Design a protein around this ligand. Structure first.
Ligand code: SAM
Ligand code: CA
Ligand code: CA
Ligand code: CA
Lengths: 1011, 146, 143
DNA sequence: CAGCCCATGGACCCAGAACCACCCACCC
DNA sequence: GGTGGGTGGTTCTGGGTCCATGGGCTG
DNA sequence: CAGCCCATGGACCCAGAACCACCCACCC
DNA sequence: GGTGGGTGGTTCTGGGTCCATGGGCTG
């Protein structure tokens, strides 16, 4: 520190005042003591006159050397006399071979650092600032050896499958034994009451692999072999491993795994700081699952939390412990649990935070840990004990970690009687801080994956009685593992506690989490949210604002560090991180910032318990509802009718778009044919195969199929079911509209009967509108992904054995007619007028948050006929995008590069792409393929935007050569070539170009007056 | 004095644990520190290696030279590597032309204080209480005028 | 025969262990040796990266160029990285004007032989007896 | 109660692009 | 002698989807 | 036989001794 | 500005003892 620099300057004058000596033998003693006191802080020590060898060999003698604990030099020092010039003698000493890696050439007047033969800092001495800078840089230089431990970490991160194959082969060939087969069926039984109630023989094989793999690395890379001989869990498992890992077999496997473990153990031996070796502990923790069992990596959500977030989350809880309660982390009674410990970074950084006096009492019985998987548990325990050795002194077994399912520990942890009673003492403790990082998993990829987060009966029961109870959300996503951990944390916490978790930022603002907030403010006295954004399941302008991910761009969900204190009305404090920041900036503001120095802005919850997105009320929002909650649910009793349209619908959902959304008529029939057949094969498959999904995933089986499959309800093709369907904006596709395949129809056969019917619908968007609110009047069967949250308001709702019953309810007609004193306004008139107002830009501009949360209340604007006629031109030119006469574009062809058929075929590939300028501006040119370029698109045609993508861009993206995400369709049914849809794409573009310009014209005639 | 001597010990093991050498040049950093720190509070200062003259010679060079605020030498220290037998390194030293007015002859685990013409008491450096008593006298020795 | 074929595999396995790199730059050395030896043993050679010129006038560079005594070309070898669908990189190479007479488009896992313009054979390069078959055919394809 | 509607937000990854090193043909 | 061009490797950086699955309700 | 006599080669240290490295006090 | 003494590491290298302990006499 600069304090030490000042002390050295006081010793420099003392030597030339008491001794009055100007000899090198006496003017250097000051710097000797200075480096010595700085070094003892870093972890090295300065040893004088170490005779070293030079490049020539001549024994040289740098006056000092920064020796390590493995006696390796991290640097050197050559003090010369105050008088002699340094730059000349630097170049004369260096000639004899003096070191150049990290030498501080000093002369009791000027200190220079030549690092890598390179002068970096020539700080003239006698400095109250940059001299401290110099010594910091010197004592923090990276040894050439640490950058190789980094290189070897990455290689192992990529030759892990090859190494794991060896261990996999071993465990299969051990199943030939009757000692393995007998003991691996008793492991399963003891582990069908402790960690996994569905412990499979293949889960026991996974544990065996992890135990052995980490055993070889713990004894070499980390030198701690005694860990496995002491850890209760290891012993219960060697009982199962030394059944096959013995004598010859043991030697064979070990010598076959050497061409992978070798290098890591030849660079991990030349570094001697555990904090650097922790980078491999993390790497192994994650990579193993991604190279072996990604199914586990999903539900467990194995991930590492960057140190910056952890350290912030520790200092912030310490600076809140005296604020609302009255204590300090290093007090007595601050029992800090941490469910979900993973690599242990939440208790290793706590050890480093705690002072080196009370640490003993805290390490012994106040720091607690909880884990479910084996690899994380082992890594965490070893890490904590090694951090204790680096901080306090003599290794002392951490005896507070456990292997229990936290959400189920409410005979848990019975794998070892030790961990059982360890989790019993944990349960009995009065815990006060609950810090940690929960899994944010919620739902599986596709239902052919077969991976649901274990239903925690006890824990989800209180969620149902608390978070879910208040939330009236039609869909319920409050059963997320993050919210389950929150429930467990609030119930462990007795009184005066600080739950600090980092999780998905959906809790702050989601229709689903509207009631979570309501209940959470009752169980707490102060809430301190810190939105770190970084959401990536969004597109367009939104993905820009969110920016980089505070989890090293490894996840796509939003992240928010929240601290809910309970001093036992609340005060919701909030600080959104500046938008458009990248990840490395976000994780720097989280190291260089103190919690008490951020400026939180009091949020006062609204009636709907919405924290963000607070609707403004000064606006004239309340007008004429298009559909109301009770217009769709009216019991067909004319009277409660309270809006314009009555029964509205939603975009068709299928769940098997790989076997339902195609271009050609028979192309779909073929994908569906194989299905209608393989479902019928899965049907003849046993009742057990139907009950526990023991069949094949060649075809997309969603819940409906899995169920009519259990009832053995064979299917059969009805060619009538296939119907033209507008998949995306201006993209007419085909679709098997049947009850067999499509998961939810949403009263679509009541709006568009039997796929083919004649009602004209207006597609709208939903709420909250993630993508900008959009409007598409369509006459073709729609899709849920056509517009953002597609919700279709129809015009002539049909009935069963019935007919076009006008939809605009009669109440709406009367109100409109009487208001404009017309008594002649028709249903079409209203329809068209509504479309014009919806399209009106200033309408959705004034009502921004009003529209993204409830149904767009259409205002009664001064003239009716004017807007009715506006929305008439709009309607027609958007219901007939394939008749609108084209706009004259220009095809400028060219020849292929060479004459090889290979080049010609590669020049027929859909390189469909917009041609943006050096300033991201479309030039009005679309490169169709490598032989044709269409140009002349007007710039006003790029303006019309249905979502986050212009109408023209939609057509290109919906005709690009994409590879199906299914394998059975990437091999037998991928037949779409840009060659098939060549001139049809050009034809579509020409007509859509005209449509785009026309829309802008009509929408421009509309003013800025907003009723 | 007692806590200070109990830290000279720590930084002795540290020279060998970090460096890995027992050559005199490197193991002398611990005793240097101890002496200088003790002298600071008392008022004096150990200025290391101040070439001191001799009765018979061109010049000699002690490795420690307590020099007071008025540049006057009142005590010295000559280190020793473990290899040499300290006693015979003493006669070798006090023959070339080394001072005897006040000098600490220390090896690494045993130390004598030849003070003003005669040895006082020989103490081992492993014992904190012993080295304390002796260094006190190296620092509480004052000339006759005082 | 099969001995030299097995030797190639051994060499490649040492490259991905003593260096750890599975990049072709280092892996090719193994196949370079195998092709050069079977050749000398059947009256030929494997001169490496000899720039050929295409009909369109592109100076192409195959990784190999089995040439014979009067300095004429008889075959051409081209090895792609073990980290790409081979049947995709074959097209890219041929679309620069790559020779189609007798070319071994080979990735570390599969070896495809083209002659005139048709895939004559594709073998798992791991099976010793199978490669031994394909390699012999390439060295015996006479104009 | 049991099928049948109605939600609603979801722990990354991989193609280009820039660019770099090395050597070869080809202007110089 | 440079230099642009073939071959190959190494970092960045930009940028975004259909569909699972519990509640609420007819019936 | 016990208790005197007669052999007969022995699994290394080390004290200088150069000799150099650094560097301060003295001749240049 | 050299330039040797003077302290310290460093690595060669030349050179050389008293005395155990079985067997054969041996009284
Ligand atoms: C994000 S990781 C832990 C994070 C940790 N701070 C780190 O940096 O590695 C989530 C971990 O929670 C553990 N875990 C413990 N109890 C769990 C439970 N009941 N449900 C899910 N995961 C649990 C899993 O084994 C998994 O390794
Ligand atoms: Ca020096
Ligand atoms: Ca000395
Ligand atoms: Ca190649």
């Amino acid at each position: 520190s600069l304090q030490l620099v000042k002390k050295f300057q006081k010793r420099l004058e003392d030597i030339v005042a008491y001794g009055g000596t100007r000899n090198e033998s006496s003017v250097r003693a000051a710097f000797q003591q200075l480096l010595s006191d700085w070094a003892e802080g870093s972890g090295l020590r300065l040893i004088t006159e170490v005779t070293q060898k030079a490049v020539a060999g001549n024994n040289v003698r740098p006056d000092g050397t920064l020796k390590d604990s493995l006696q390796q030099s991290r640097g050197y020092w050559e003090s010369k006399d105050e008088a002699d010039t340094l730059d000349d003698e630097i170049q004369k000493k260096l000639a004899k071979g003096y070191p150049r890696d990290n030498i501080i050439f000093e002369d009791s007047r000027l200190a220079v650092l030549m690092q890598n033969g390179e002068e970096v800092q020539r700080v003239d001495m006698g400095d109250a600032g940059a001299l401290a800078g110099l010594l910091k840089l010197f004592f923090e230089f990276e040894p050439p050896q640490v950058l190789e431990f980094r290189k070897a970490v990455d290689h192992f991160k990529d030759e892990m499958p090859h190494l794991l194959k060896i261990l996999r082969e071993a465990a299969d060939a051990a199943e030939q034994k009757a000692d393995y087969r007998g003991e691996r069926d008793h492991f399963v039984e003891i582990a069908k009451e402790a960690i996994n109630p569905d412990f499979s023989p293949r889960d026991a094989r996974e544990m065996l692999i992890q135990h052995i793999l980490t055993g070889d690395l713990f004894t070499s890379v980390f030198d701690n072999a005694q860990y496995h001989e002491d850890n209760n869990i290891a012993q219960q498992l060697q009982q199962l491993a030394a059944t096959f890992y013995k004598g010859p077999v043991k030697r064979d496997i070990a010598e076959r795994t050497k061409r992978y473990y070798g290098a890591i153990q030849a660079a991990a031996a030349q570094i001697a700081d555990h904090h650097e070796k922790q980078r491999f502990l993390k790497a192994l923790y994650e990579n193993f699952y991604r190279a072996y069992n990604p199914a586990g990596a999903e539900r467990l959500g194995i991930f590492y939390t960057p140190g910056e977030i952890v350290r912030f989350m520790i200092e912030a809880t310490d600076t809140l412990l005296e604020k609302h309660f009255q204590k300090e982390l290093a007090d007595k009674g601050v029992e800090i649990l941490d469910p979900a410990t993973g690599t242990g970074t939440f208790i290793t950084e706590l050890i480093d935070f705690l002072p080196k006096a009370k640490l003993e009492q805290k390490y012994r019985e106040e720091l607690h840990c909880n884990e479910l998987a084996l690899l994380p548990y082992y890594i965490a325990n070893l890490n904590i004990e090694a951090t204790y050795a680096q901080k306090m002194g003599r290794y002392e077994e951490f005896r507070n970690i456990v292997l229990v399912d936290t959400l189920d520990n409410t005979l848990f942890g019975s794998v070892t009687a030790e961990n059982l009673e360890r989790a019993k003492r944990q349960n009995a403790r009065p815990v006060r801080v609950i810090i940690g990082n929960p899994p944010y998993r919620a739902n599986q990829a596709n239902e052919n994956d077969n991976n649901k987060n274990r239903e925690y009966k006890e824990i989800d029961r209180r969620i149902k009685a608390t978070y879910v109870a208040a939330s009236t959300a039609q869909k319920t996503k409050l059963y997320d593992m993050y919210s389950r951990f929150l429930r467990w944390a609030t119930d462990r916490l007795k009184e005066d506690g600080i739950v600090a978790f980092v999780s998905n930022s959906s809790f702050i603002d989601s229709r689903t989490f509207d009631g979570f907030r309501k209940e959470v403010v009752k169980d707490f006295d102060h809430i301190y949210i810190l939105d770190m954004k970084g959401n990536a399941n969004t597109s367009g302008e939104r993905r820009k604002r969110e920016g980089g991910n505070v989890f090293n761009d490894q996840i796509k969900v939003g992240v928010a560090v929240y601290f809910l204190v309970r001093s036992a009305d609340t005060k919701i404090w909030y600080h959104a991180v500046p938008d458009f920041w990248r990840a490395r900036e976000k994780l720097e503001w989280l190291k260089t910032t103190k919690f008490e120095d951020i400026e939180f802005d009091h949020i006062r919850p609204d009636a709907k318990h919405n924290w963000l997105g607070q609707v403004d009320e000064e606006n004239d929002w309340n007008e004429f509802l298009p559909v109301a909650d009770k217009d769709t649910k009216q019991a067909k009793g004319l009277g409660q009718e309270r809006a314009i349209f009555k029964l509205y619908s939603l975009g068709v959902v299928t769940n098997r778009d790989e076997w339902v959304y195609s271009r050609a008529e028979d192309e779909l029939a073929d994908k569906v044919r194989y299905f209608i057949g393989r479902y019928n094969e899965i049907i003849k498959l046993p009742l057990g195969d139907l009950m526990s999904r023991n069949w094949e995933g060649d075809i997309k089986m969603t819940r409906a199929t899995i169920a009519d499959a259990q009832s053995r309800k064979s299917y059969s093709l009805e060619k009538n079911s296939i119907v033209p369907s507008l998949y995306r904006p201006f993209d007419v596709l085909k679709m098997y509209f049947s009850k067999n395949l499509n998961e939810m129809q949403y009263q679509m056969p009541s709006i568009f009967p039997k796929g083919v019917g004649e009602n004209v619908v207006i597609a709208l968007s939903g709420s909250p509108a993630a993508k900008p609110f959009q409007v598409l009047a369509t006459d073709i069967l729609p899709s849920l992904d056509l517009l953002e949250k597609t919700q279709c308001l129809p015009f002539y709702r049909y009935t069963m054995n019935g007919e076009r019953l006008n939809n605009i309810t009669d109440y709406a007609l009367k109100a409109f007619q009487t208001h404009y004193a017309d008594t002649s306004i028709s249903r079409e008139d209203i329809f068209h007028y509504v479309y014009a107002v919806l399209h009106h830009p200033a309408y959705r501009e004034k009502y921004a948050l009003n529209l993204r949360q409830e149904f767009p209340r259409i205002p009664f604007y001064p003239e009716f006929g004017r807007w009715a006629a506006w929305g008439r031109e709009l309607m027609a030119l958007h219901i007939g995008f394939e008749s609108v006469a084209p706009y004259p574009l220009k095809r400028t062809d060219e020849p292929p590069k060479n004459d090889t058929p290979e080049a010609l075929a590669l020049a027929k590939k859909a390189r469909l792409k917009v041609q943006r300028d050096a300033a991201k501006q479309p030039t009005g040119a679309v490169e169709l393929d490598g032989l044709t370029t269409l140009a002349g698109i007007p710039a006003a045609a790029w303006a019309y935007k249905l979502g986050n993508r212009s109408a023209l861009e939609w057509v290109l993206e919906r005709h690009k050569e994409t590879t199906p995400k299914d394998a059975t369709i990437r091999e037998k049914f991928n037949t779409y070539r840009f060659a098939d849809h060549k001139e049809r794409v050009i034809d579509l573009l020409a007509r859509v170009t005209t449509v785009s310009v026309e829309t802008v014209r009509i929408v421009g005639e509309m003013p800025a007056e907003t009723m």
